Design a protein around this ligand. Structure first.
Ligand SMILES: O=C(O)CNC(=O)C(=O)O
Ligand SMILES: [Mg+2]
Ligand code: NI
Ligand SMILES: [Zn+2]
Length: 331
């Protein structure tokens, strides 16, 4: 079995290997990459996402979100307070302000220490889930707006034709902006490209150990767990690496820098934080190996998780028994 310790693998495809996206995912899996839940892909030196980022300031962040924490430094939840619209240029100036800017630090490890010590005492503002793309239309390789769609994958594997669409989303971050512990909708893959700016630190639990994380989360968030049998689908709970180690949860960590891709694999729980002003693009995708995870994915039916239109079909076809309860939670 490849990668039996479930380490995060880093790949350096050549320009020729960068042509066929599906093939390369399957290659990474042949080497055991999925066992970690997360892999990094460094593009070939010849590749670029677009020519420059000099002209992005007029993108609108319609609903910036202030991430307000509750709990203790290593075990907390966050809620998202809506703020007034602002442009990417306005958001960048805010991120760089004395109130929000990255503190002085020695290296990524020092910054990570500072994040986990101090995160809860601040409320950073995040631009999330902004439909759109920063890839040039002429970028042919690893262009996250030109991937094969999940609806087409389901039709190819299973024969069923379904409604829905699959487009990318932009994220604008600042110091301490935080992504809570989660798997993807329907335990899909994700891919994330860091277009510009400061790094993103990731934490990940191997898919084969995801239920260990779920059991700790039910212990640490006991009211949330009583409220919903899949409350991590609410994407609000944080647990620090120190707490994970104290509780024997297997995990790994890595820092993504600008110009790098990260792939998350089905049922790979992940969480993390941004180091400073940045812009990322991400989208969910599927492969044939996803189908069995889609069929088994947990679902939130309490009403909290509310998700895209296109997830309807996935539940309807892959999880017909669950469909009525889950759709009630959507309505
Ligand atoms: O940019 C982000 O925070 C969101 N990314 C992830 O949780 C991911 O790509 O799966
Ligand atoms: Mg612009
Ligand atoms: Ni994710
Ligand atoms: Zn729920």
């Amino acid at each position: 079995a490849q990668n039996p310790n479930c380490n995060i693998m880093i790949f350096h495809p050549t320009k020729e290997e960068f042509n066929d996206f599906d093939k390369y995912i399957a290659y990474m899996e042949s080497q055991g990459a999925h066992r970690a839940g997360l892999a990094k892909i460094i593009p070939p030196k010849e590749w670029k996402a677009r020519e420059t980022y000099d002209n992005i300031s007029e993108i609108l962040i319609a609903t910036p979100l202030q991430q307000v924490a509750s709990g203790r430094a290593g075990v907390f939840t966050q809620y998202h307070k809506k703020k007034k619209a602002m442009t990417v240029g306005e958001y960048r100036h805010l991120a760089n302000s004395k109130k929000y800017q990255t503190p002085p630090h020695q290296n990524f490890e020092d910054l990570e220490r500072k994040y986990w010590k101090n995160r809860i005492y601040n409320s950073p503002i995040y631009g999330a889930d902004i439909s759109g793309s920063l890839f040039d239309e002429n970028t042919k390789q690893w262009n996250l707006g030109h991937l094969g769609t999940i609806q087409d994958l389901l039709e190819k594997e299973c024969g069923v034709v379904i409604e829905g669409v699959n487009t990318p989303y932009l994220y604008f971050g600042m110091w301490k902006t935080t992504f809570a512990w989660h798997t993807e909708d329907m335990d899909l893959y994700s891919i994330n490209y860091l277009h510009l700016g400061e790094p993103k630190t990731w934490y990940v639990v191997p898919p084969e150990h995801g239920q260990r994380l779920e059991r700790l989360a039910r212990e640490l968030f006991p009211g949330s767990s009583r409220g919903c049998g899949a409350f991590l689908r609410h994407k609000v709970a944080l647990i620090s690496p120190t707490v994970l180690k104290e509780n024997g949860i297997p995990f790994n960590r890595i820092t993504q820098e600008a110009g790098e891709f990260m792939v998350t694999f089905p049922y790979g729980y992940h969480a993390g934080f941004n180091h400073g002003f940045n812009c990322a693009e991400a989208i969910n995708f599927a492969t044939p190996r996803w189908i069995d995870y889609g069929k088994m994915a947990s679902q939130c039916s309490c009403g909290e998780a509310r998700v895209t239109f296109s997830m309807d079909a996935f539940v309807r076809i892959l999880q017909p028994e669950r469909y009525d309860l889950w759709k009630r939670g959507q309505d």
